[PDB]
Amino acid sequence: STQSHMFDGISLTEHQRQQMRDLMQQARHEQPPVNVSELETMHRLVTAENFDENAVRAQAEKMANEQIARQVEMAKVRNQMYRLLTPEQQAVLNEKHQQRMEQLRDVTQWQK
Amino acid sequence: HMFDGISLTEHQRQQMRDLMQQARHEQPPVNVSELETMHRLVTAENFDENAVRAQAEKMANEQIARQVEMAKVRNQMYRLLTPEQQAVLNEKHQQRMEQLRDVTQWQK
Ligand SMILES: [Zn+2]
Numbered sequence: 375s376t377q378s379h380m381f382d383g384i385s386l387t388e389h390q391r392q393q394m395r396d397l398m399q400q401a402r403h404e405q406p407p408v409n410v411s412e413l414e415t416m417h418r419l420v421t422a423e424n425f426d427e428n429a430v431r432a433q434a435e436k437m438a439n440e441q442i443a444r445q446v447e448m449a450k451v452r453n454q455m456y457r458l459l460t461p462e463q464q465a466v467l468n469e470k471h472q473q474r475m476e477q478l479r480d481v482t483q484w485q486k
Numbered sequence: 487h488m489f490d491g492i493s494l495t496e497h498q499r500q501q502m503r504d505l506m507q508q509a510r511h512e513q514p515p516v517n518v519s520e521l522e523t524m525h526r527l528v529t530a531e532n533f534d535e536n537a538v539r540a541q542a543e544k545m546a547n548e549q550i551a552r553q554v555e556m557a558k559v560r561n562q563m564y565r566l567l568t569p570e571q572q573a574v575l576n577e578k579h580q581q582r583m584e585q586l587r588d589v590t591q592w593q594k
Pocket residue numbers: 414417418579583
């Protein structure tokens with residue numbers, strides 16, 4: 375899923391938005407477009423009378439081992455978008471990120 | 487989502503919510519560490535494809551365990567259902583599948 379609102383709280387000259395959106399949808403491209411297949415077999419497994427954990431694990435690992443490519447590509451794009459920014463815009467980015475992290479930890483502790 | 491369109495006694499509704507909480511228990515927490523080193527990679531002046539790969543995988547593991555535990559519980563819930571309800575679920579499943587398919591050839 376897109377990082378957007380990734381440039382929330384950030385703006386971001388208009389040519390910067392041009393260069394951004396072009397191509398940020400290339401980051402909407404090579405996102406994860408699921409199969410009716412993955413979904414059908416997943417469904418069959420989940421709906422089964424007795425559960426086959428090893429099967430579902432197998433299917434998960436396949437799916438992931440797949441996505442990894444996309445993951446990497448979209449990471450590349452993201453990095454480009456990042457490089458297209460000013461150290462202060464960046465500052466704000468890294469701040470947003472760090473916030474997000476803290477939130478995640480708070481949630482970890484609460485659910486611990 | 488997966489029950490979208492099924493109901494469903496209060497007793498069993500609470501069973502399922504109970505199971506849901508205890509599931510947000512048995513499942514792996516978001517490894518904020520890997521997230522750190524990832525953001526860190528993504529924001530470096532020069533980009534290390536292989537490094538990023540290493541991290542992607544290193545996270546993949548938690549991703550998998552999540553999928554498996556989530557399926558474990560979804561299946562527990564399905565078990566809780568009654569024959570009727572399970573059939574309704576099949577209805578919704580097939581509808582969903584239709585929409586999906588009919589769309590996966592659109593516009594073609
Ligand atoms: Zn089916």
